[PDB]
Design a protein around this ligand. Structure first.
Ligand SMILES: Nc1nc2c(ncn2[C@@H]2O[C@H](COP(=O)(O)CP(=O)(O)OP(=O)(O)O)[C@@H](O)[C@H]2O)c(=O)[nH]1
Ligand SMILES: [Mg+2]
Ligand SMILES: [Zn+2]
Ligand SMILES: [Zn+2]
Lengths: 778, 66, 129, 57, 57, 49, 196, 121, 69, 44, 289
DNA sequence: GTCAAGTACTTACGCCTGGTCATTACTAGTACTGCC
RNA sequence: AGACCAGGC
C-alpha cells in the first residue's frame, strides 16, 4: 500500500485528452472564487447585481431653466440600468472574441458597457430613455461576461487558452493585470479605538473614540466616528468629499427620529440609574445641547438646521427644501448600512455607540485592536471594481449637467423636451467610461472626486506575472494592508498575531520591506462573496429568549446586545446569551433549520473584567473570512470566522481534545499553511526563516508558465525544458494539479565538503550532467 | 422624574431647566409649557466615588494580596 | 411548582404601551385601539388625546411575527390565572406647542463652519486677508 | 531542486565610456542604457578612511 | 535552490572524472556543503535525502 | 573591489587581478569575504578600475 | 544528529519536570500560595488582571521565562555531548560547532535536544483579548507550552501549535533586519559628516 | 387620521382588577398553542410534546433592587367598554406596575461530545 | 518536456525506456518497482528518470498552429 | 513658497537625497567600472 | 547620547555610593525619604457628595489606616494635614476657577477642641470659597471639606477634577527625583540608584552617601553642575556600557574623539544640523541637510 | 519684562535590476451632407 | 528625467 502516489497512468491520460465534462483538480478553482465570484456579483444575483444597485444609490440630479416664482423645467436626469455585454468584435454580424486573440493583438480584452439614461422633465411629464454605450469595459477572464465561463478543459484547449486555466485577471493592453485584495476594518461593527491622533481634532478632544464602517448594499463604504470631548459632550465625525465635518450628536439624535429627551437618557442608561459616572457625563451632553442650541425643539426643526448647513457642499439644488435635504444628510451619511426606512434602527445603534464610548472612558472596556485580524474585512478587487464604476457613472451623470450649465450660461437655444437637444448635449460629454477603467487597471491610481473610504490612493493593480505557476497562483491569494502602512516606521502592525490561525499563512510572507504587510491565505480560507440570508433569523431569536429592541430599556456591559449584521435585534442576559450562541451553532450545523445558513458567523463575546465589550454579534454579510472546522457533537463541517474564533476552543488534532473545554477540531493541521507553504517537504523540521524563503524563492523559479506559449505574446517569459515531479511531495501537490507545471529536477545531491568551490552558500554541478540537459531552460 | 442631578418632565420627557437658575416657585417645561413648583425639587443629592484604579500605588497593590 | 389556567381571551381586550420612566397623564386621557383583519400577525395603532399633547403609538410589525405577549391576572390563594392576549405597542408622546413649529422652506460658503474641522477654521481666517 | 530566474546574463554590467547625462555630464543610470555604477556617500567616506586621496579624485 | 531555503550560485561546473563516485557506480550532480546546514537548521532537507533515495530505489 | 553597504572602510579594498578564461563572474577568495561581509547566494559587488 | 536510547530517556524525563513549571511560576507572580490548582477561581481572577496591564504582564512573562530557560540548561548540559550517539570527532555536526566552522551550541541544542522558549519583544507569545494564546489552548491556562516554550527538536519535529509560535519569533528577526537598519544607518550618517 | 383597514374596536372584554392578586406579563412565542394550556412552572414545561424554557425577566422592565422603575404601562378599558385607559387602582395617579414577568422560550438539547468516537488514537 | 535521452548522473541511455514503461504499467499490470527493474534500470540515478518523468509534450502538442480544429 | 502635482522649483533641485549635492556631487556615477555576481574561488 | 544631545533624557538615573560603615537596613529605609510620595499614593478613595438646591460640594476623602501608610511611606498624620491644607486645596482652587471662567462660552461631634475651629477658620480665611474643614486628629483616616458655588455655574465634574489634583499634589518630593532604589551590589561596591537627577539636593546627605563618587547618567545635568570635563567623562562611560551589554569591543580612542568633538565648545553639541551651525565650512553644511 | 501654548519646520540604510504609464476638456472651425 | 509596481543582496 502506497503512502502517497504519483499517478503516471492517470496524468498521461489527462495529457492526451482533456475531460469533456468539468475540470479535474477542482481545488484549483476554489482558490480564485474570491476573484471570480466577486465580479459575478456585480452583474447577476438578487436585485440585478451590484451595479444596478449602485445606480439606484446615485439617484436623480437636476438643473433648471431660466425661462419665466418657478425656476423653469426640472431635467431630473438619471441612470436606471447599467449592463455589460460579453466582448464581441465587429468585422455586419459580430464574432466572439476569445482572449487568445486579445493577447496576440496586445490590446485589452474588453466588453461593451451600456448605460440607459432617464431624461425626465417636469417631475414626470415625459421621459427619454436612451441606451448609451460608454466605451469598452475590461472584462476579466472566466467570469459570467467572459466567453470562457462554462467551458470544459477540452474546449479551453480548442480555444487555445489552457486546460486547467483559472481566470481571475484582466487583460489590459495585452498585459495580464490583476487587482489586489485589501484588508480593512469589518463592516457594521463599531470598535472602540484609542488613538492619540483623535486629540488633534481641536480643543479638548480625548484619545477615546468609536468607529463604525458601514457599507451600503452596493458594497460602497462610509465611516461614522464619535469622539469623546473632555468638556463632557461627544462629537460625530464624517467626510463627504475629501474634507472632514464635526457635528454634535444630539443634533443627529434629534434628527433621526422624534425623541423625548429622556429617550436619549433611557437609551444610554439601562437600569443602572445609580451609576454616577454615567449620569454626570450625560448631564453635560443634554444641557450642553440646550445651552448651545436653545431653539430646534422638534424633529422637523433640527432637520432643517442640519440641511441648511450641508446644503452647499452636498450640491443641493434650488428645488430641495431644507427639510428634505436634511434627510438627504441622514440617508447618505449617518450609519448608511440601515439605509432609508431604518431611522429607528439607525437611532438605536447611535445610543449603543454612545454607551460603548462612555463605557470606554470608564475603563470598563478594552480598545479593540484595528491591526488584529479579528476586526478585519477583505476588499475583493471585484467590489473595488464596482465602487469605482459607481463613481465614474456618478461623475458622468454630473458631466451632462455641467454641459447644460454652460449651455444655460453661454448659449440660449435650449428645449429640455427635444430629442435632438438630448442627442446634441450627449455628443459633448466624455462618455468613454471604459477608458477610465482601463486607465485604472493599467496604472492602479484611484481618480475619484469623492475619495473612497480607504486610506491609500495608488497601487491597486499589480501585473500578474506568469513567470512560474507558483508565482501565478500566489497573486490570487495575496492580501495587502495598504501603502499607508509600508511608508511607516512602526513595528506592531507587521507582527504575526494568533488571531490569524487558519486565515493568514504564518509562513508565506516576503522577506524585506513588505514583511508582515503583504501576506497570503491559508488554502482553505474562503471569502464570502454574496449576501447570506438574514430574514428568518430574528424570527428564530425571539422564540429563543430575546426580548426585542423596541421594548427593552437596556444598555451597558451588564447585559449583552444581540446584533445581526449591525442592527440591534434585541436584548438578553449574559447567561441566556451564551445558550443561544451554542444553540444556533448546533442548529446551523444540523441543516434541518430553514433559516440558519452554514455560512453564518456567530460571534459571542462573553462578559469579562475590563475586556472586550460583551454582546452577541451575528454576521452574515459580504467579504468576510471563512474557514471550515469540524464540530464535535454531530461531526460535520462548521464554517467560522476570525471574530468568532477568538472565544472558542478548536483543537488542532483529535488526540489533544480535552474534556469539556473543546468545541471544535480542525479537519487537518495542514490547512493553516498557504498554497506554497504546504508544498515544501517536511516543513516542521526547518527553521522558520528558512521556510519563509522557499515561499519567496519557490515562486521565483524557472519552471513552466503554461503550455499555450505558441499563442502568448508576453514580453519576457522563462521556460525550463525538462521538469520532473518530485519523489518527496505533499498530498496537496497532486491535488492542485501541480504536475501540470513542473518546476525542478530530482537531483542526486551529495552533502559533502569535497571541492572547496562550495563553502559559504555556494554549490557546484557535475559538468557532464549539464552536457546531458540537466537543468536546461530557455 | 428625578434621576441624578437632573430632572425630567412627567408629560413629554423633556430635560427641565436648572431649578436654581430659574426664578421663584415655578419651573416651566420648554416644550410642554407645563410648570412644576420649586417645592418637590428640594435638594439634588449625588454621591460619586473615584474609579478604584485612579490612584495606583505600592500600598494599593497590598490590598488584594494580603 | 405549577400555575393553573382558567381561560384564554382570544379577542382584543387590553394592550401594553411603553413610553419612558415617569410617564403620567390626566385621568380623562383615553385611548383608541385600531385593527385590520390580516392573519395572526396583527398590527394595531394607539391614539390618544388631551388638550396640550397627543399620545400615538403602533405595534412592532418586524418583531410581532414571532412574539405573542399575554397578560395574566393571578389569584395567589388559588393557583388559577386568566390569560389575556395583549399586544405591546411602541408609543410616543407628540406635543402641540412645538409640533407644528417650522422654519421656512429654503433659507435664502462660510455657512459650513459650525460643523467644520479645526484647520478649516484657520484657513478661512487667512481668506479674510 | 529548483532553478531560479536570477541568471548572470541579466547582470555583469560594465562600462569604460558611453553615454553621459546632459546637464551633469555624468554617466547614465542603467545596465541596458550602458551606464555606470555609483560611488555614493557611504563609499566616499570609506575611501577617505583609508587616507587615500587620489582614489577619491 | 532546494525546497528548504538553501540558495546559492553555481561556482564551477565540476567535471565528472573529478567528482566523488560510489560503489554503486553513480556520481552526484549537485554537491552541497554540509556547513550550510547547522547555522540554518534545515533538517527537512536531510530527511528529504533519505525519503528521496528510498523512493527512487 | 567594493560591496554595499560600505559600512566600515575594509568593505572597499584594493586587489590585484588574475584574469580567468571561462565565465562571466568575479572570483573572490574566502579570506576576503569576512571583511566584505559577503555570502555567495547571489551577491554582486562592484569593481572600480 | 541522533541521540542514544539512554539520551532520549534523559531528555524525556527532564521535560516531564516542565509539566508544572507554568503554574508554579504563575502562582509566584500573582502571590497566591504554592500548590494551588490550575483551575483555581482566585488564580483565574488575578491572571485576567495581569493580562490587562502591559507592565504586570511583563513580569509574568519574565519569571516564567526565567524558569523554563533553567529547564533548557538542564537538558543541554546532560544530553550534549554525553548522550550523543555518534560523538566527537566523528560527530560532524558537533565538530563544526565546537570548532567554530559554522554554527553554535544553541544551534545544536535546537537540532538535537530542545528548541526552547520562543522569545518575542522581550516577552513570551502574545495573548488574545480572551486570554487564549492560540485557539488550541483554553483561556488562561498556566501551561508552559501555552506560552511558547516548545519541547520539540528539529530532529523529531515541532507540533502545529509549536510551529505557529516559532513563526512569530522567526518573523521578528526579519522585521528588525529590514526596517530597523534605517535607524542605525542614519547614526553613522550623522556621525561621519562632523568627523570627516 | 386612521389608515387603511384599521377598524376601531367598539366593545371590549372583562378586566377584573380590585397577599392579594398580582398582575403578570407573560411572553410566548407565536408557535405556542395557548388556546389549551393548563400548567405553568416558576424551569421548563411541556407543550405539544416539546420542552420550553421559562425564566423571570423582572430585572429588564424594572430592576430587582429599586422600586418604581417600570416602563411598560398597562392599558385597561374605560368604564364604558368603548376605549382604553391607564391602569389605576391605588388612588396615586400612578400606573399599576407588573410583578412577575415570565418568558416562555424555545430550547433544545445539545448532545454531549462522544469522547470515544472522536478521540481516535 | 519529452523523455531525456542519456540520464543525467551516470550516462545510461534511458530515452527508449519510456513507451515500454507505459506498456509495463498499463497492459502488464505491474507496479513501479518491478517495471523499472525489468527495463534494466538498476542504479537509482537511472530509476528516477522514468519514474518521475512528467512527459509534458503531450499537453504541448494539442496546440497545433497548422491544422483547423 | 507658492500656493497652488506642483512643478519643482530651483530650491528643490538641491535639497535632499535626490537633490544635487547628495545625488550628483557627494556621490556620482563613474566610468571605468563593472559589477557582477561573485563566485568563490580557491587557488587565488 | 550622540545624535540629539537630549538634556530631556528618557530615563535619568544617578548612582550613589553607600558608605562601608552604614548598615544595609540603614539604606532601604533611607531611600523611603528620598523616593517621592504623591497624595495619590495615600488615598484609598474619594467620595464627593454634590448638593444643589447654591451648588455645594462635600469633598470627603478616605485614606488608609495610619498603621498602614505611615509604615510604608513614613508619612506622619500631621504632615498629611499640611499637604491638604497648604498644597492640595490651593491647586484645587487653581482648576475650579480655571473652569468657571471658561465655561462662559460615623464621625464624632464638632466642638472637641477649639483648635479644630481655629484651624477651620484659617482655611475659610486664606482660601477662596471653602466654608468647612476637618481632619481626623486621632487616626488620620479621613479629611472632609465643603466647597460652595453659585447657581450661575453649570455642572463641574469634581471627581475628574479632584483626582488629577491628587495626582499632582506631593507629600514629600525631592525636586527632579522620583524613586530611590537599592539594588544588589554589582562587582563589590555598594550602590544606590535613583530615578532622578538632582545633585544639589543629594549634597545634604553626607553621612549616608559618598558625595565624591556620585556618577550619573544625564550627560547634560552633570555638565551643568560638575563642569565640562565631567560631562566629557560621563559621555564615554555612558557610551561604553551600550557596547558592554552586547559584548562588543570598541577601543577608547574612537570614543575619546566623539566625546571631545561633542564638547569642543564647552557646551554639549549634538551631531545634527543644530550642532554643526557653528562651523567654518559652508559647503559641508550645504551637503548635510 | 518673563513665561508660557501653540505653531512650523526638518529629518528618517546603501547599492543594483526589471516592467508600465504619460492632459484633458472644449471650443471654434472647416467640411460633410441633407435639404428645397 | 519622474510616478508607481515587482524584486535582488
Ligand atoms: N544595508 C542593508 N543591507 C542588507 C539589506 N538586505 C540585505 N542586506 C545584506 O545582505 C545580507 C542578507 O542576510 P540575510 O537577510 O539573508 C540573514 P541570513 O541568516 O540568511 O544570512 P546567512 O546566514 O549568511 O545566510 C546581510 O549581510 C545584509 O548585510 C538592506 O535592506 N539593507
Ligand atoms: Mg548574500
Ligand atoms: Zn414637558
Ligand atoms: Zn543513471
Amino acid at each position: 500500500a502506497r503512502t502517497a502516489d504519483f499517478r503516471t497512468l492517470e496524468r498521461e491520460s489527462r495529457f492526451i485528452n482533456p475531460p469533456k465534462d468539468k475540470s479535474a483538480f477542482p481545488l484549483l478553482q476554489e482558490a480564485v472564487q474570491p476573484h471570480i465570484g466577486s465580479f459575478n456579483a456585480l452583474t447577476e444575483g438578487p436585485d440585478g447585481g451590484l451595479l444596478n444597485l449602485g445606480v439606484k444609490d446615485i439617484g436623480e440630479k437636476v438643473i433648471f431653466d431660466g425661462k419665466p416664482g418657478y425656476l423653469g423645467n426640472k431635467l431630473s436626469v438619471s441612470v436606471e440600468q447599467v449592463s455589460i455585454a460579453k466582448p464581441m468584435s465587429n468585422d455586419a454580424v459580430e464574432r466572439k472574441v476569445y482572449p487568445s486573440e486579445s493577447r496576440q493583438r496586445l490590446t485589452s480584452y474588453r466588453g461593451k458597457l451600456l448605460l440607459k439614461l432617464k431624461w425626465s422633465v417636469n417631475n414626470g411629464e415625459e421621459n427619454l430613455f436612451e441606451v448609451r454605450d460608454c466605451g469598452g469595459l475590461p472584462v476579466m477572464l472566466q467570469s459570467n461576461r467572459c466567453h470562457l465561463n462554462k467551458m470544459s478543459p477540452y474546449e479551453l484547449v480548442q480555444h487555445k487558452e489552457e486546460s486547467d486555466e483559472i481566470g481571475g485577471y484582466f487583460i489590459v493592453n495585452g498585459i495580464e493585470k490583476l487587482i489586489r485584495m485589501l484588508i480593512v476594518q469589518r463592516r457594521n461593527h463599531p470598535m472602540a479605538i484609542i488613538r492619540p491622533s483623535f486629540a488633534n481634532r481641536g480643543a479638548s478632544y480625548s484619545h477615546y473614540g468609536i468607529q463604525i464602517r458601514s457599507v451600503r448594499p452596493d458594497q460602497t463604504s462610509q465611516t461614522n466616528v464619535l469622539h469623546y470631548l473632555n468638556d463632557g459632550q461627544v462629537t460625530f465625525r464624517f467626510s463627504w468629499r475629501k474634507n472632514e465635518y464635526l457635528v454634535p450628536v444630539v443634533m443627529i439624535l434629534k434628527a433621526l427620529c422624534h425623541t423625548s429627551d429622556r429617550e436619549i437618557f433611557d437609551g444610554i442608561i439601562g437600569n443602572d440609574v445609580k451609576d454616577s459616572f454615567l449620569t454626570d457625563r450625560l448631564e453635560l451632553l443634554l444641557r450642553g445641547f440646550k445651552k448651545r442650541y436653545p431653539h430646534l425643539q422638534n424633529r422637523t426643526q433640527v432637520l432643517q438646521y442640519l440641511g441648511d448647513k450641508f446644503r452647499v457642499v452636498f450640491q443641493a439644488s434650488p428645488d430641495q427644501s431644507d427639510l428634505e435635504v436634511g434627510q438627504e444628510v441622514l440617508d447618505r451619511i449617518v450609519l448608511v448600512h440601515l439605509g432609508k426606512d431604518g431611522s429607528q434602527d439607525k437611532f438605536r445603534m447611535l445610543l449603543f455607540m454612545i454607551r460603548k464610548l462612555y463605557s470606554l472612558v470608564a475603563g470598563e472596556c478594552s480598545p479593540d485592536n484595528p491591526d488584529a485580524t479579528q476586526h478585519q474585512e477583505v476588499l475583493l478587487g471585484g467590489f473595488l471594481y464596482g465602487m469605482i464604476l459607481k463613481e465614474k457613472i456618478d461623475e458622468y451623470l454630473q458631466n451632462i449637467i455641467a454641459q447644460v450649465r454652460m449651455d444655460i450660461n453661454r448659449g440660449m437655444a435650449i428645449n429640455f423636451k427635444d430629442k435632438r437637444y438630448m442627442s446634441r448635449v450627449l455628443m459633448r460629454v466624455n462618455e468613454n467610461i471604459g477608458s477610465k477603467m482601463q486607465y485604472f487597471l493599467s496604472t492602479g491610481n484611484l481618480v475619484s472626486q469623492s475619495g473612497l473610504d480607504l486610506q491609500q490612493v495608488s497601487g491597486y493593480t499589480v501585473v500578474a506575472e506568469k513567470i512560474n505557476f507558483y508565482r501565478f497562483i500566489s497573486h490570487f491569494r495575496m492580501v495587502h494592508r495598504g501603502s499607508f502602512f509600508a511608508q511607516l516606521k512602526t513595528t506592531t502592525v507587521r507582527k504575526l498575531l494568533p488571531e490569524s490561525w487558519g486565515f493568514l499563512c504564518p509562513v508565506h510572507t516576503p522577506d524585506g520591506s513588505p514583511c508582515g504587510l503583504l501576506n497570503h491565505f491559508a488554502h482553505k480560507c474562503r471569502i464570502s462573496t454574496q449576501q447570506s440570508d438574514v430574514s428568518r433569523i430574528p424570527s428564530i431569536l425571539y422564540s429563543l429568549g430575546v426580548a426585542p429592541a423596541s421594548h427593552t430599556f437596556a444598555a451597558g456591559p451588564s447585559l449583552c446586545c444581540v446584533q445581526i449584521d449591525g442592527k440591534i435585534i434585541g436584548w438578553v442576559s449574559h447567561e441566556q446569551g451564551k445558550i443561544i450562541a451554542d444553540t444556533l451553532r448546533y442548529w446551523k450545523v444540523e441543516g434541518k433549520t430553514p433559516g440558519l445558513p452554514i455560512d453564518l458567523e456567530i460571534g459571542y463575546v462573553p462578559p469579562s473584567t475590563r475586556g472586550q465589550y460583551p454582546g452577541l454579534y451575528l454576521f452574515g454579510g459580504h467579504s468576510r473570512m471563512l474557514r471550515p472546522v469540524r464540530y464535535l457533537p454531530l461531526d460535520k463541517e462548521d464554517i467560522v470566522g476570525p471574530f468568532e474564533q477568538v472565544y472558542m476552543n478548536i483543537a488542532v488534532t483529535p488526540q489533544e481534545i480535552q474534556n469539556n473545554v473543546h468545541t471544535h477540531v480542525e479537519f487537518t493541521p495542514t490547512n493553516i499553511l498557504s498554497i506554497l507553504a504546504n508544498l515544501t517537504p517536511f516543513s516542521d523540521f526547518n527553521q522558520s526563516p528558512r521556510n519563509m524563503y522557499q515561499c519567496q524563492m519557490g515562486k521565483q523559479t524557472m519552471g513552466t508558465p503554461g503550455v499555450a506559449l505558441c499563442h502568448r505574446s508576453d514580453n519576457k517569459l522563462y521556460r525550463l525544458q525538462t521538469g520532473q515531479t518530485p519523489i518527496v511531495k505533499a498530498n496537496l501537490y497532486d491535488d492542485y494539479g501541480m504536475d501540470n507545471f513542473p518546476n525542478g529536477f530530482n537531483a542526486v545531491v551529495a552533502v559533502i565538503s569535497y571541492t572547496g568551490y562550495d563553502m559559504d552558500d555556494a554549490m557546484i554541478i557535475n559538468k557532464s550532467a549539464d552536457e546531458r540537459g540537466f537543468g536546461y531552460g530557455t | 422624574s428625578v434621576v441624578g442631578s437632573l430632572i425630567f418632565c412627567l408629560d413629554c420627557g423633556d430635560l427641565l431647566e436648572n431649578p436654581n437658575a430659574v426664578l421663584g416657585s415655578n419651573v416651566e417645561c420648554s416644550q410642554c409649557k407645563a410648570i412644576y413648583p420649586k417645592s418637590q425639587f428640594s435638594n439634588l443629592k449625588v454621591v460619586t466615588t473615584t474609579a478604584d484604579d485612579a490612584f495606583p500605588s505600592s500600598l494599593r497593590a497590598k490590598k488584594s494580596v494580603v | 411548582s405549577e400555575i393553573e389556567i382558567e381561560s384564554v381571551q382570544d379577542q382584543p381586550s387590553v394592550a401594553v404601551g411603553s413610553f419612558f420612566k415617569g410617564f403620567r397623564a390626566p385621568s380623562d386621557t383615553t385611548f383608541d385601539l385600531y385593527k385590520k383583519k390580516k392573519s395572526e400577525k396583527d398590527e394595531f395603532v394607539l391614539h390618544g388625546e388631551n388638550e396640550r399633547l397627543e399620545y400615538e403609538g403602533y405595534t412592532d410589525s418586524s418583531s410581532q411575527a414571532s412574539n405573542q405577549y399575554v397578560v395574566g391576572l393571578f389569584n395567589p390563594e388559588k393557583k388559577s390565572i386568566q390569560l389575556y392576549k395583549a399586544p405591546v405597542l411602541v408609543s410616543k408622546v407628540v406635543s402641540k406647542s412645538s409640533k407644528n413649529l417650522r422654519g421656512p422652506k429654503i433659507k435664502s460658503l462660510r455657512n459650513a463652519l459650525g460643523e467644520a474641522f479645526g484647520t478649516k477654521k484657520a484657513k478661512k481666517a487667512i481668506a479674510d486677508l | 531542486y529548483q532553478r531560479l530566474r536570477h541568471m548572470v546574463n541579466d547582470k555583469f554590467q560594465v562600462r569604460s565610456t558611453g553615454p553621459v547625462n546632459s546637464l551633469t555630464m555624468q554617466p547614465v543610470k542603467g545596465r541596458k542604457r550602458h551606464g555606470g555604477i555609483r560611488v555614493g556617500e557611504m563609499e566616499r567616506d570609506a575611501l577617505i578612511g583609508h587616507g587615500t586621496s587620489f582614489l577619491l579624485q | 535552490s532546494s525546497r528548504h531555503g538553501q540558495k546559492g550560485v553555481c561556482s564551477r561546473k565540476w567535471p565528472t572524472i573529478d567528482m566523488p563516485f560510489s560503489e554503486t557506480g553513480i556520481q552526484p550532480d549537485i554537491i552541497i556543503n554540509p556547513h550550510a546546514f547547522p547555522s540554518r537548521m534545515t533538517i527537512g532537507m536531510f530527511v528529504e535525502s533519505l525519503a528521496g533515495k528510498a523512493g527512487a530505489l | 573591489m567594493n560591496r554595499q553597504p560600505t559600512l566600515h572602510k575594509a568593505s572597499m579594498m584594493g586587489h590585484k587581478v588574475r584574469v580567468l578564461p571561462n565565465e562571466k563572474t568575479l572570483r573572490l577568495h574566502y579570506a576576503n569575504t569576512g571583511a566584505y561581509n559577503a555570502d555567495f547566494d547571489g551577491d554582486e559587488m562592484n569593481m572600480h578600475f | 544528529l541522533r541521540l542514544t536510547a539512554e539520551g532520549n530517556k534523559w531528555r524525556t524525563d527532564i521535560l516531564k519536570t516542565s509539566v508544572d513549571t507554568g503554574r508554579e511560576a504563575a502562582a509566584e507572580v500573582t502571590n497566591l500560595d504554592k500548590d494551588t490548582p490550575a483551575d483555581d477561581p482566585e488564580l483565574l481572577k488575578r491572571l485576567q488582571e495581569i493580562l490587562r496591564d502591559n507592565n504586570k504582564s511583563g513580569i509574568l512573562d519574565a519569571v516564567t521565562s526565567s524558569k523554563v530557560n533553567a529547564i533548557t540548561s538542564q537538558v543541554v548540559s546532560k544530553c550534549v555531548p554525553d548522550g550523543t550517539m555518534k560523538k566527537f570527532p566523528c560527530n560532524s555536526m558537533q565538530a563544526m560547532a565546537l570548532s567554530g566552522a559554522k554554527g553554535s551550541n544553541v544551534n545544536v541544542s535546537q537540532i538535537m535536544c530542545l528548541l526552547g522558549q520562543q522569545a518575542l519583544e522581550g516577552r513570551r507569545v502574545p495573548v488574545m483579548v480572551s486570554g487564549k494564546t492560540l485557539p488550541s489552548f483554553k483561556p488562561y491556562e498556566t501551561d508552559a507550552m501555552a506560552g511558547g516554550y516548545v519541547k520539540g527538536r528539529f530532529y523529531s519535529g515541532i507540533k502545529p501549535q509549536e510551529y505557529y509560535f516559532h513563526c512569530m519569533a522567526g518573523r521578528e528577526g526579519l522585521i528588525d533586519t529590514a526596517v530597523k537598519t534605517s535607524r542605525s544607518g542614519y547614526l553613522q550618517r550623522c556621525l561621519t559628516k562632523q568627523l570627516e | 387620521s386612521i389608515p387603511d383597514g384599521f377598524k376601531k374596536c367598539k366593545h371590549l372584554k372583562n378586566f377584573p382588577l380590585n397577599k392579594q392578586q398580582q398582575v403578570w406579563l407573560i411572553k410566548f412565542p407565536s408557535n405556542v398553542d395557548i388556546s389549551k394550556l393548563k400548567s405553568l412552572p416558576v424551569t421548563t414545561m411541556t407543550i405539544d410534546k416539546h420542552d420550553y424554557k421559562i425564566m423571570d425577566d423582572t430585572d429588564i422592565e424594572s430592576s430587582l433592587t429599586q422600586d418604581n422603575l417600570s416602563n411598560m404601562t398597562l392599558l385597561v378599558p374605560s368604564e364604558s367598554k368603548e376605549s382604553l385607559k391607564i391602569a389605576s387602582t391605588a388612588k396615586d395617579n400612578a400606573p399599576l406596575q407588573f410583578d412577575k414577568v415570565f418568558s416562555v422560550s424555545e430550547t433544545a438539547k445539545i448532545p454531549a461530545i462522544d469522547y470515544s468516537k472522536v478521540r481516535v488514537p | 518536456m519529452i523523455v531525456p535521452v542519456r540520464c543525467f548522473s551516470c550516462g545510461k541511455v534511458v530515452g527508449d525506456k519510456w513507451e515500454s514503461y507505459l506498456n509495463l504499467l498499463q497492459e502488464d499490470e505491474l507496479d513501479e518497482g518491478t517495471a523499472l527493474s525489468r527495463l534494466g534500470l538498476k542504479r537509482y540515478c537511472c530509476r528516477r528518470m522514468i519514474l518521475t518523468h512528467v512527459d509534458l509534450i503531450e499537453k504541448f502538442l494539442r496546440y497545433n498552429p497548422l491544422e483547423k480544429r | 513658497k507658492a500656493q497652488g502635482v506642483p512643478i519643482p522649483g530651483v530650491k528643490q533641485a538641491l535639497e535632499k537625497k535626490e537633490g544635487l549635492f547628495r545625488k550628483h556631487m557627494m556621490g556620482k556615477r563613474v566610468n571605468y567600472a563593472a559589477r557582477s555576481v561573485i563566485s568563490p574561488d580557491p587557488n587565488i | 547620547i550622540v545624535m540629539t544631545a537630549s538634556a530631556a533624557i528618557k530615563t535619568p538615573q544617578m548612582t550613589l555610593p553607600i558608605w562601608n560603615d552604614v548598615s544595609d537596613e540603614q539604606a532601604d529605609t533611607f531611600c523611603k525619604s528620598i523616593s517621592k510620595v504623591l497624595l495619590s499614593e495615600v488615598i484609598d478613595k474619594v467620595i464627593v457628595t454634590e448638593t444643589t438646591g447654591a451648588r455645594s460640594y462635600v469633598i470627603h476623602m478616605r485614606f488608609f489606616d495610619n498603621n498602614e501608610y505611615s509604615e510604608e511611606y513614613d508619612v506622619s498624620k500631621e504632615e498629611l494635614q499640611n499637604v491638604i491644607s497648604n498644597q492640595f486645596i490651593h491647586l484645587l482652587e487653581a482648576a475650579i476657577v480655571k473652569e468657571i471662567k471658561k465655561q462662559k462660552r460615623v464621625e464624632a461631634n464638632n466642638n472637641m477642641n477649639k483648635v479644630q475651629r481655629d484651624r477651620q477658620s484659617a482655611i475659610i480665611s486664606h482660601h477662596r470659597f471653602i466654608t468647612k474643614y476637618n481632619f481626623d486628629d486621632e487616626s488620620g483616616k479621613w479629611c472632609e471639606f465643603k466647597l460652595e458655588l453659585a447657581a450661575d455655574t453649570e455642572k463641574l465634574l469634581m471627581v475628574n477634577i479632584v483626582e488629577e489634583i491628587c495626582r499632582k499634589s506631593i507629600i514629600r518630593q525631592i525636586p527632579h527625583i522620583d524613586r530611590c532604589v537599592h539594588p544588589e551590589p554589582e562587582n563589590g561596591k555598594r550602590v544606590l540608584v535613583t530615578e532622578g537627577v538632582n545633585f544639589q539636593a543629594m549634597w545634604d546627605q553626607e553621612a549616608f552617601i559618598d558625595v565624591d563618587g556620585i556618577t550619573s547618567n544625564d550627560v547634560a545635568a552633570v555638565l551643568k553642575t560638575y563642569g565640562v570635563e565631567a560631562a566629557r567623562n560621563t559621555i564615554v562611560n555612558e557610551i561604553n556600557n551600550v557596547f558592554s551589554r552586547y559584548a562588543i569591543s570598541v577601543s577608547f580612542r574612537h570614543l575619546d574623539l566623539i566625546a571631545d568633538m561633542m564638547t569642543r565648545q564647552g557646551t554639549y553639541l549634538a551631531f545634527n544640523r543644530q550642532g554643526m551651525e557653528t562651523s567654518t565650512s559652508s559647503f559641508m553644511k550645504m551637503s548635510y541637510e
